[model samples]
Target chain A: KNLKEAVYDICCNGLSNNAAIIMYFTRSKKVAQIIKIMQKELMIRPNITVSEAFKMNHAPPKYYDKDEIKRFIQLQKQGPQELWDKFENNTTHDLFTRHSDVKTMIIYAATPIDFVGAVKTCNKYAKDNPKEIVLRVCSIIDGDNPISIYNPISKEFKSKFSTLS
Target chain B: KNLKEAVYDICCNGLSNNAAIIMYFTRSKKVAQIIKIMQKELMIRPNITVSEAFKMNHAPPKYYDKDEIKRFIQLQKQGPQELWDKFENNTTHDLFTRHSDVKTMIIYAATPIDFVGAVKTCNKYAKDNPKEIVLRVCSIIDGDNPISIYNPISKEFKSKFSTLS
Candidate 1:
């Protein structure tokens, strides 16, 4: 009954694995051309290092500016805590700035909480809204393997990954 | 007489120092906002590392994709040879692709070529054109510093930074 809500279920092999590729298309608003770079450059290596794959397929920025790329790599190097933090913020900022109705709820945690643990947190995370949340699984790295979730909007445990370990 | 030619002579504190700031606006096509980001984020430190400044001012892409950022940091890691190589090509590629009349002559070198060596190359490199040589000194980082030259279109030397060292 609650499944009737809007859910964007995106599938993927891995999240970080396809991050550059996914973000590339996401900012370009040319999600369609992703398949071109994917098949042409990305999927070929299957597990090509992020930097390598990204280097081969590098282009210019269009949405924001060139400096954003420089900042992103540093966050990426600093580790997971802030990598996704700044990233998700900027991505959502774009949407929010363009549309007043757009507000993003970020689910940031660095610790590894398995499936069952994640399910419990889902309700806890979303309980504040107190609405039966139907998710839209927008897959950034949609591959033929498996996919991971972001924001953990349905979680119950909180450590920050230690508040983050 | 040659001074009459079109020269986009850009000035800056140094080249790499201001690169990210220069590029941010280059991609956004909003060269105006550069001041906002510069005063707000980038220029606070006269010699901020490329990655540090880039990460702080980062945003979503506008011209190409997110992958370009990843690739750039790596090239930057690999040293100056391919770093500017890829960057110059992509920047010019954008303009070239948009206009058939636009063509870019790349000047890639890692060696420390001084102003005289650079000035000499100016003619040798451009003798083919044999007309008059005009230049666009587009500063990626236009700060309160001296400017450098590229392409050495007037040069008589032949080593490429080593071809590059």
Candidate 2:
């Protein structure tokens, strides 16, 4: 309803589980293609883990000019709150700027299985959203970051057992 | 990169400061509207926060078609992690089922100005992405949660200032 009310919901619920997968598409097309392969061949919906890797880039503040970076450093000098704000705001920026791009396609899924399903489902949708050549799937991991898929589908990325397999 | 490796990259850096906006957009349309308003009117960019919301109608495999009220007694039968996972996965399912019928938008301002800026930012995005609407603006409160808008452009949500006169 209001901004404070909005933030309260975030603190309580956090991000969706599919956030990581959705982000993977924006950060790397290679991962997006691999995920497509996983969905097609393995039928294994891979679950993304929120590791240090996911947070490094997809956290927020989508873009920064030289002045913003300087301001960020100076803000860090202010105290923890400022630093926290800087990081948080920046992460927010990152999320939006990427989303604004016509090239970006963000998808959310709950479980690893759900993510797999959504990927397959979205692939069908992709035929229409021609601008969204790449699809990123993600979910909320512990803490603030999302679990992202950015690699080519390797043997290790395969599911232990797949319904298709 | 391989899928596993790409996933690792997304987990680490694919989403970053100002990049996690896409994740925030998955929450609600009001948030997106606010971000756009803030950017255009107030010259402030806000972050987005998201969380899971549950519905009573959904049931787990263990309790499919069983009694609703009495099922509360059987809580201890399931592991907490299992239940949590079930909820997360199911919630993820609810989220990804929808497609962006419309595009979502938000502002990218250098600083938080006032309530007018914040509200305007949200309003603008709301106008832009009416169908694929989700929360577009918030402050980054926790790095874990990401967005927690400190400067509230909307008088109602502003944490720092209140309007008078």
Candidate 3:
């Protein structure tokens, strides 16, 4: 069901690991051809290791700290019920104005309802500023353990600490 | 001069290496967003090695043997003058049709004119079957040592043995 094997072979023979992986995912014949061209220009080796193929020194910097997480939790607890309720109601414009200091937020969930409420709030934030703002939703289990980052624009979720950690 | 740094950050933080590299090459913000979605659905790691990230088994089977290379060289030397003239004139269609058994061809060059003639022939092959065929041009420096694979579509050249050498 996947072209991963074929793409891998090309990577092993001549393409860089990064180029091969990208080629597999895109599955564009045109891209496959382009990769062949890059292989020639870069003078790539066959069956190279990942470290040897691509320079892997540019992982993202940490964005959240212990104090920031604590501040976020405190804000969630201290905010007026009406304002938080608005997040549940699909209105995030007011939430942004009321919490001007918070650039990011975390929603901790212990139950299905809490998760749903947090998702809705995140959705509202995304829709309110669809063009200019990128609403990021960070979900944590319990109070300290991290889970995923949800980007509103891409509608995709990413693991929190796979790269550097 | 390049978006490699930014793309690398995304890959470190959950975006697949292949997706990040493709996004950098294509320069599509939309593709970046879609990659995010894939990350969520695929449960991709925050960062992964190239081999771990892309399945690597399906490279092209070794298609030529010494005899085949001998035959190719023989054909090149003994082929009709008119056929060779067409290659010189940038017409490869007749050459391909006449040599029905040859699935691949190598164009040797030692000068600018010879190189241009080879490129024209490859371009003709690519244009003949734009969608179904991939015309690969392999170049060698000292008559036998291979160097690159030229792709007409992307107008890029890649090394023949760049990965494992």
Candidate 4:
């Protein structure tokens, strides 16, 4: 299967990621084209170190403080579930309220910078239920850190963090 | 206006960008949420330099060699139209085929790492047609270099590069 085929195949059953909702815009023939155009232009831009890429001069040092760094590092092995636990119901709270079919919903999007790669390897595996995917409200995940979610279909959007932070 | 308000305002007429089609997944409250989730985890991950980020190691060194660099640099000043000329009609060849309303089509998507920006700033834009945008075929840009494009609506997709490359 080609890249398009693979993604189409995933969508057939309903596209999503895990613990079942940390969806990414991973592989797509369409997104690839836009990125391709950006890539050529990006090539001319001066290259910076990864350190520069991740630099957070605007934010306080506490973001990467020892404990925060340690916890963030350990969370990787723990995976999404561990993080999900931290956010708890707070994560899906507005999501469920926003969409009646929250159980089957998939929040998804892609980056303009993420290049499209081979189909054979990109989106072969998706864990969402085929039955619910079709009926569920396909919402757009929003905000930064437990920020919010919205249904493109309903045009109904909400943010948990708009006033919290 | 918040980030959500800004993007919503932009999407009201239609969401798009450049010589009128180089769309990016910038400033979304929703994508920002997903990215926030990814960020906590991303921090622990190895941070590579920006140089490494663009390294086309698999491809021949020619991608970044002198002549290519100069052309790419000049490309920035030239903008999308210049590159559009490079790909020329070929750039939008299949786009026209994939949709009847290709003239009004807007290719779009977002990345996992593109953070959700503030509403007062992000997505307070968009230079698309207020009337036509609503009716156009909203397609997904695909492929790398001059790969292909598709319409998520018609599900009609065509690629110019899969076979070429």
Candidate 5:
């Protein structure tokens, strides 16, 4: 029962489908090398494609800076009176800037239904006013949040149906 | 100034960058509508693209399973004399499975140099074997962990040089 024999049985003996091996390599390179070796020697074929791998100590990229935030706030204020009236009337929740590189507005709401309404109102306003800004809606419920992006360029709101815990 | 005025000034004036406004909505639809209204009123023009916006909650799909783990361990026990000899000689560390979707391997290394050597060996093995499995090398120093993903599909390690902390 040597290491090579164990790997061969694991890969070729109808066990590879439901089994995975865990070993330790001091260096990252060996990790890759050994897995390939096992796959080749044992003739193991994978069922899925490996497009991306997770990295340790990696964070999401920052989209907005101080100056951009300032500009976003200023632009928000100059919005139409009806919109401000709605905000004052409690028709919508809060508004903030998303990515700095894009003229994108993030609308935070309590539910998905309200988010669609907000998008329609905002989209109409944009159409009538002759300006283009991407609109996004975020639904928050007890800290469970889902975001939907409206591409003014495409005239559609891309909703992520996936749940974000 | 009252909260409304304050919010307005924060968004339009230089203070917008420093301040953010939070509101509440009963539905997600309303959220999108209001923002569009605001955008039309303010005449904001977006400058960035939206290609990467869908990845907010999208995790990589799973590729492996529990049976694979069992098989992998069994194979390790049967590795060749040379492989075990290297393990005994401290040329590699322990190996492990990362995610379940791809035939991905995670290698932990003590230093970046050692990781590169391991990667070379493993990568060569893959090239010779002609099967695709994503290889990853992680370098750890005093708890600072950095990961490099070797795309066997593309023959290069796409390094994400972003800080995680």
Candidate 6:
């Protein structure tokens, strides 16, 4: 029923992928009003890609490895659950805790410099493969490969070895 | 600090038991506003209980049982590899899920009606106990327990919940 309000929320909170911002805005019109004001004040039109509007909401760091490491295991049709079992309560005080296999997957996901770059990459890949049906391909790509897509600076992003090697 | 903003959200979103109303006024103000607005406009506010408010923020219904859910599970425990394994890859359409255990836990936490009676209960409990320690105990009991405290309904009364919980 509150379509305008929902639209506004999408523009502000979803734009950056900042989940916390949604809570912040839920408590303050000043934030919403200010964001609306900024939209008008800056005279900046809305960007098509929501991620470009705000910072990407980060999934917790350690989980990032699960997706990648699982992919490296290359068990056909394996998803997050498989990775979860492999990592099995592993903890680290530092950044990530997933295996090196998963870590490498993150590197592939983070190849882009920023959200805009990521969007461009998605558009290019979808365009090159016309036979492939993709809508908002970037989201699909990220969703399909969360570990790599979540954090660009993850250990998974740093470690890469060629299969040829 | 952002109390007024919270009021707007409560109004717009309608009350959803134990939700973000705590961020606005006390349960009283929330109750009062809904009553006032409903009386003035001849509209009915949603039947929100104190427990529902807790659920809105604590157990968000939306967002499939994805990484966010996994993050929540991990935060409450310490096993790493096992913790990661607990991250459910399955999609969840409802907040309560299939488990009814947490549902009972939430309902028992407190309710709007409980808050409705809390002020008197607090005073009586404090008076009967009689001591600085007793008063302190009363405050904690009144503060943490939703049923005995205030919420958006209390906000109209101009008293904020001493404890944010």
| Winning candidate number (DockQ) | 2
Model 5 error, position B120 (Å): 0.8
lDDT for each residue of candidate 5 in B1-165, tens digit (9 for 90 to 100): 133333333223221111111222223334345433433322121111111111111111122234433433343455444322322211111332222222222222222222222234434444443433222221111111112221121111112101110
CA deviation > 4 Å runs, candidate 2: A1-68, A77-79, A84-105, A120-132, A139-165, B1-18, B22-36, B42-165
Per-residue CA lDDT of model 6 for A31-142, tens digit only, reads 3444343223211211111111211111112112333323323421243333223322222233221111100000012221122222333333334443321212111101
Ten-residue region with minimum lDDT total, candidate 3 chain A? A90-99
Classified by CAPRI criteria, candidate 1 counts as incorrect
lDDT of each: 0.21, 0.30, 0.22, 0.21, 0.25, 0.22
Residue-by-residue lDDT tens digits, candidate 2, B64-144? 122321221132134333322232223222121112223333222323221122333444454586654443222222222
What is the C-alpha lDDT profile of model 2 across A47-75, one tens digit per residue?
32211112211113322333444444454
Q: Can you tell me which runs of candidate 5 are displaced by over 4 Å?
A: A1-165, B1-101, B136-165
Best by TM-score: 2
User: Residue B60 in candidate 5 has what lDDT?
Assistant: 18
User: DockQ of each model against the real complex?
Assistant: 0.02, 0.06, 0.01, 0.03, 0.03, 0.02
lDDT of 6 by residue, B47-164 (tens): 1222111111111112212333234334324433332233222222232212111110011112222222222232343344343101110011112212222243334222222221
Q: Name the fnat for model 6.
A: 0.00
- CAPRI band for model 2: incorrect
Q: How well is each residue in B32-129 modelled by candidate 3, as lDDT tens digits?
A: 34433432322221111111111111111112233433332333344333212222111111111010111211122222212222233334434544
Better of 1 and 2 by DockQ: 2
| TM-score, per-candidate, Cα-based | 0.18, 0.30, 0.17, 0.17, 0.16, 0.16
Which regions of candidate 3 are displaced past 4 Å? Answer: A1-165, B1-103, B137-165
Clashes of each: 49, 107, 20, 22, 76, 46
